[PDB]
Amino acid sequence: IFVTAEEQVKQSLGVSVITKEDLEKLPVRNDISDYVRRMPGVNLTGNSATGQRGNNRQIDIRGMGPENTLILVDGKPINSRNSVRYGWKGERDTRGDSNWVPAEAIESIEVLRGPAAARYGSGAAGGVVNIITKKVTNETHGSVEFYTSQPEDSKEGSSNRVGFNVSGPLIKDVLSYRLYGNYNKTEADDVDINKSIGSTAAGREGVKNKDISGRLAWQATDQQTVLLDISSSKQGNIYSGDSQLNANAEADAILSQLIGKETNTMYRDSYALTHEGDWSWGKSKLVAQYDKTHNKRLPEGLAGSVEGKINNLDDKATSRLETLRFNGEANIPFEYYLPQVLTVGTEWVEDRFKDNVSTTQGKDSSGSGYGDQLAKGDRSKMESRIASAYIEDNLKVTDSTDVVLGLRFDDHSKSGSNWSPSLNITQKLNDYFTLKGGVAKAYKAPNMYQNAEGYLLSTNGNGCPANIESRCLLQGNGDLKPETSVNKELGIQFQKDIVNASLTWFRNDYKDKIVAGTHVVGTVDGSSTNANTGAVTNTKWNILRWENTPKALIQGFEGSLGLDFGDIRWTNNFTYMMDSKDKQTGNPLSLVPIYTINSIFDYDITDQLDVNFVFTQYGRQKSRQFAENRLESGIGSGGANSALKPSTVKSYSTAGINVGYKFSDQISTRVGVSNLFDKQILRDSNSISQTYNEPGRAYYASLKYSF
Template sequence: MRNGCGWARAIETKRAGSAGHRRIGKRLLAAVSGMALSLPAIALAQEADDATLLEAIVVTAGGYEQTIKEAPASISVIGQDDLKKKAVADLSEAIRTVPGVNVGFGSNGTRGISMRGLGSSYTLILIDGKRVNAGATTLRKYNGDLNWVPLDAIERIEVVRGPMSTLYGSDAMGGVVNIITKKASNRWTGSLTSEALLPASAATGKTHRLGGYVSGPVLKDLISFSAYGNISRRQADNPAYSNDIEVPRGTQDFDLTGRLTLTPTDDQTIKLELGHAREKYNPFLAPGDVDPETSIERTTASLGHEGQWEIGKSTTNLYFEDATNTTKTTGIDIESRNYALDSKLALDPLDYFFTHHLIVGGEVRLEKLNDPANLGKSNTVTGSTGSPKADFFTGALFAEDKVEFNDRFSMTAGLRYDYHEQFGSHFSPRTYFMYELTDTVALRTGWAQAFKAPNLRQLDPNWVTTSRGRGCGAVGGPCEMVGNPDLKPETSNSFEVGLTYDDSEWKGGLTYFFNDMKNKITSARTASLILPNGTKYVQQINVDRARSQGIEGSLTIPVHADLSWTNSFTYLLESKNLETNMPLSADPELSVHSEVTWRPRENLSFTASYDYYGKQVDYVSTPETLIAQNVDPYSIFSISTKFDMNDNFSFKAGINNLFDAQPATTSNYKEDGRTYFLSMTSTF
């Protein structure tokens, strides 16, 4: 950590308070009892404490570095140790165990991250704080914006549950997933991981993956270089083993990113990053397969600056993303381009009546879409055609202040102003209170308003897309969906209240959340036009109110020095469209994750996990309407082991879905069947 970092000093000073006194007290008691501690042992203990301290620091909840206990939001962190325990088919599987989070199922077995009963479109995905928007090139059959970074390059994943529009604007109504990559190293280090997931039957496709990361100095103390990449291939699932429901058709993925970090002084850092990636869907066509091969290519470039000044720390990023979706049989490209400039200043703590942690910032963003497959089509309702190109500009200013009234009570208040050239101005306020009842128990409660802007297709009157049912709303499918330039943003009022407990060994929390949405965008209640062949035209409109509420919790039990037991659950009391009484998303009523890790030796660990998913619903179409299809409860058991042979080689192996569980349903729900995995990592 560099000298002069005010936020880091503030964090370390505060952490050195009650927690520091407890650690010192325990060590003094041990010494009085006659425990002999050598200097090396003390040094190792101090390193362990420092590691714990670093792992506790997050940036997503407040826009600056702070501990999880101090963060003004419900936030969970998935660290390197969590990612290394077992093999996952994709990154969504790793996030799935966080309370309040569920992996939704879409067409062709694709997935998305849903939070607190809202759909995946309400979750904002970030990589190092930069928005990922490759999904704008596709309407269906896309695995989401999570899998553009290999596990080897990930430092941690921060998951914020609840609206974060004050800091991040549109699309953060449900929550934020921020993938934090590893920082540049002052010595050459790297890793290479080879992994194979081998299912017990053809019901699930095989997966092979090769990923790597490297970082080190080019010019000592001045320029460093980092790079990471991944090549993976998953074979298609066989629908014959799954009652011929839609299943994943197979993928081939590739990504490569390089970063130069320049540090002209201890207080100034400049980063230049370039990346290119490709996700290819359905590359292994089976006989009679009607789904064509498609690929999404994503190119990114960013220039960033971090500066430590006398008044605080500034962060500025200029960012570009180009994503192209190509369908092999038609040769039609859908291209999305995004340009963004954001900057923020986190001021050092200010003493004005109380202690203030103030952050101010702004953002400008230009989004462009060239979609000849869906935009500019002949609209039968209006009798017009249009351009396949659409774009909009948006700008924002925000400020947030965390006020510490005393050592135990604080309030965070924030306000964001967004300007959108098509729907005008919008304000997003939030307040969050934290009160430490004791040294171990804290009360947390907050309220926030959030919004989700209509996307470029929804705002375009000449967006015309065929839907087989899901997009047709109450009129049923098939239908033609058309856009509406008069749409308003979706808005929400959200509230949460909870208790957390943390004595450095036992950790737990219980939170009640409530979301009330207005102006939900959906297809019209009645068809605007029915063609002679029966095809219905429906326009996107703002009519719905929706609500979700529930309870989420977590508990870590220190069974033994070598045995840890972590648990989490989510219970959805309600998640429905109040106009139609249909569910908002395909989320289970109750989900439970329980995991035990035993470490008999420093270099050897065993992990067993249990996941329960209660009754849930998904939409299936009938000739005239949409109905809710119940999905029966089911459970998944998995086991794994990790062995570090030496400082340079480690292995992990195990079985996912040990008992080959599958939900009983006729809709698009399908879990990966029993799968054996083996992974080897080489580091230097």
């Protein structure tokens, strides 16, 4: 049977595929990023290379930053983090969107890196993580699973899960369901975990997850199928003391009270309806989906020494993000000169966003604050629309040569239209080798804060670019161009039986990335009235705006190695990172080790008994190297002492073992330990390299009923 372009590029070098089986052999604590991170060209890093909110690490692909990692679930985009205020330097106080589907509910995970991911449009310049959930089943198969992790160190949080999955027929062979549920609670790290090295940065914040999700599958005709997906999730945090400038939580009037409490809460509801036709001329797929996300959390400083810190014990505000999305698509096999499979498709997406707490700034009772002049109209509501169409061909150019030619057109309501060409070649050399490559141009539309004229922020001086003197404002920009990136990869794939290997060069030229601008587009006079006196004072502000900056360069090598001896097996990879630099600042896009080596080992001792070993090795993580504002350039209010202090985390390694006993056909269980050598790093507030907590030694166990 025929093979579409989409299917074919999942044979690309920059693609890997995790199974339910892998996931079982190496249990996750909560967030799957802890297993996804082990793939070639993948990292776990903060939202920006500044290090702020460093324990908020999420899936990074080839060092392009997590804003550039598009998470999908069964093919449908998640975008809940856009709820969260995106700040002056690219920071967001989110944990991201790789934690919406409980580990035990996952059938498969597809990681697409580089050229193979540009297909999927806005936000895929880094890559795509496609979480594939368990399927409907024509006989009732059940699962219940528990998990616990138990850190040696008293100050690190233990974690606990329970969850179920059940699927069956309601009507044999025409209507069937899948339903899965999960309650996870990972306790926070103590407030004071990082103190023993003079550091005021918080440890990891905890999370209570509540997830429920339902699928109905209906075979309406011999050639027509209808899927319904309804899911709802709630994520409530457990506050560990985090704050953008790493204040001393325990000695802060307010924060000290919020510890161990829920200060932010993330709600997500999602509905999708899908129709799939199986026609004589080929195949078709229509999708409607609607997503509703609320972001409820305590308010915060939005400038100065209080920036990024909680103002208040009580007055929670909520932000509301609705997405409606439609997708239609057809696959037709035909033969003109060569065998082909033409894909042709349409996509429509609209976003509506309410945010009334971030979109207030420079409002003054005189009616002449800086924002009263620059931002008029309802600043609280933002719209985005993308209309897209694409065409794709999978050609057998020879019985040895498989080639994919795609083109994608995108038209965004603010940024304009944009073309994304996409080549992808597979070329057998012989029974054992094969050559592979792709070139693709990825897209990303501005994020809503970056676009929005009603979003204003300020510094008194320190945040200003080193070449400006006093006070700067940063406004959103409706006239931004979209982010574009030409992503190339090329490599060799080897496979005898028992042995396989790849090596692949990758290189992305990332263009017009949207960031805090450095040119003053003009100036404005802003009145600031004294609350109690009515005394006015006018301030000349320099106006900066979000702006696309010309070029960043990413480059490196991925290799992988597989050694299968039946009962004994080894899966290893490495990734070497030759280049991560913006050609203007000289800084890296995203803090990631210069190299990362991974090894997984499996040995089935008996049919029941199993042992499993994991080892990971990280080369050196350098900090940002070059100043981009007054403070960093040694001319802020703190002078030369507050100047940038580049530093680099020294390389290191961690390991883990399991013994995995299947007590029965029905009952499984797995006991193990992680960071076997207690290689434990604490987050240093006085550094811009040591930005995160590497958890120490932890004993964990998981048992699974299967009925």
